[PDB]
Design a protein around this ligand. Structure first.
Ligand SMILES: [Cl-]
Ligand SMILES: [Zn+2]
Length: 216
């Protein structure tokens, strides 16, 4: 199977006719409802999770994994990594590894940088630690439309960027309107198109055995 680069920004799925719906900054109190919706549609998603959220909601981390979704790293503290030293960037990653090792029994090989901010130093750390670096090719901007009257604008951006060939989509399951309204709109549209709605690792051709590794 494919070799997938480490320490190099990945924006787009490679498996034809796939789409990866992804959710950042959780788990949150809305994540369980989103998991219910994903199971109704029989799809898989990817969750790039944070430190305090994972420590507060370990049972949601376990439920994400048991229902076949992928857990990726979003750093512990959500710091813009180019504002940090090499050692500090390492610590942002390994501190979340301690949390995830204890909650889900392994650690991710996929990460998403806060705000998509990268520089050479950040990419060097991710290469050295063995992380695939994922940003996005669809960005819902749902954080800025988190109200019933605004959330349709995130769907319009989603559809337009999907039509432009985007296939790796950023939303936040910390936002109520993303879970209660936008996710169903995205899932209906991807179902209508007959897309394979799957994890980031799967949409890159990576077997699930490679989305995680044992403790360092
Ligand atoms: Cl440094
Ligand atoms: Zn984030």
């Amino acid at each position: 199977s494919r070799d997938i680069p480490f320490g190099q920004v990945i924006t787009t799925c490679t498996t034809p006719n796939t789409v990866a719906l992804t959710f950042d900054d959780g788990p949150s109190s809305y994540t369980p409802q989103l998991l219910d919706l994903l199971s109704e549609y029989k799809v898989r998603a990817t969750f790039f999770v944070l430190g305090e959220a994972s420590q507060s909601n370990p049972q949601i981390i376990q439920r994400i994994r048991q229902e076949g979704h992928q857990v990726g790293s979003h750093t512990y503290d959500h710091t813009s990594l180019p504002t940090l030293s090499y050692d500090q960037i390492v610590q942002e990653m390994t501190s979340l590894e301690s949390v995830l090792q204890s909650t889900m029994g392994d650690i991710p090989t996929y990460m998403r940088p806060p705000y998509f901010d990268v520089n050479d130093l950040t990419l060097q750390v991710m290469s050295d630690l063995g992380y695939h670096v994922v940003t996005a090719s669809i960005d819902t901007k749902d954080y800025n439309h988190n109200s019933p009257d605004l959330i349709s604008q995130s769907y319009d951006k989603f559809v337009t960027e999907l039509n432009n060939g985007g296939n790796l989509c950023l939303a936040h399951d910390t936002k109520e309107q993303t879970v209660v309204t936008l996710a169903k709109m995205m899932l209906d549209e991807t179902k209508s198109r007959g897309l394979t709605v799957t994890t980031v690792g799967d949409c890159l051709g990576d077997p699930e055995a490679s989305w995680y590794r044992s403790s360092r």
